[PDB]
Design a protein around this ligand. Structure first.
Ligand code: NA
Length: 129
């Protein structure tokens, strides 16, 4: 599923991401835009052999099991394919654990490099939220 901007904002708000650990909703929509272009089916391989999955590009090195990342962890206790679903629940619940791990949203390289320090509220302008 390729989400619309306001559609994703509304679903993220309903799932409790608005101001989660102090990150306003625009931060999450900005992160999703530059991580996956709002596409739940996005995948990208990393140099170490791990793979990033879904709308927030969650990494198999620590967070999910994809059967092809030996020696890795599965801290969200999910198969990585669950993160590609049109239902974003698994992605949001895993993202809540990531952002709580001490580094905040700096865990997402696209957020640090393209969202941090910008007017992130622009990403929800016009939405009925
Ligand atoms: Na893993």
């Amino acid at each position: 599923k390729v989400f619309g901007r306001c559609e994703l904002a509304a679903a993220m708000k309903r799932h409790g991401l608005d101001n989660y650990r102090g990150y306003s909703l625009g931060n999450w929509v900005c992160a999703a835009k530059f991580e996956s272009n709002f596409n739940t089916q996005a995948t990208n391989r990393n140099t170490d052999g791990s793979t990033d999955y879904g709308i927030l590009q969650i990494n198999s090195r620590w967070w999910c099991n994809d059967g092809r990342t030996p020696g890795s962890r599965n801290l969200c206790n999910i198969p990585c394919s669950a993160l590609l679903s049109s239902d974003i629940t698994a992605s949001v619940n895993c993202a809540k654990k990531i952002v709580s791990d001490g580094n905040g949203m700096n865990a997402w390289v696209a957020w640090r490099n393209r969202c941090k320090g910008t007017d992130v509220q622009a990403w929800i302008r016009g939405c009925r939220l």
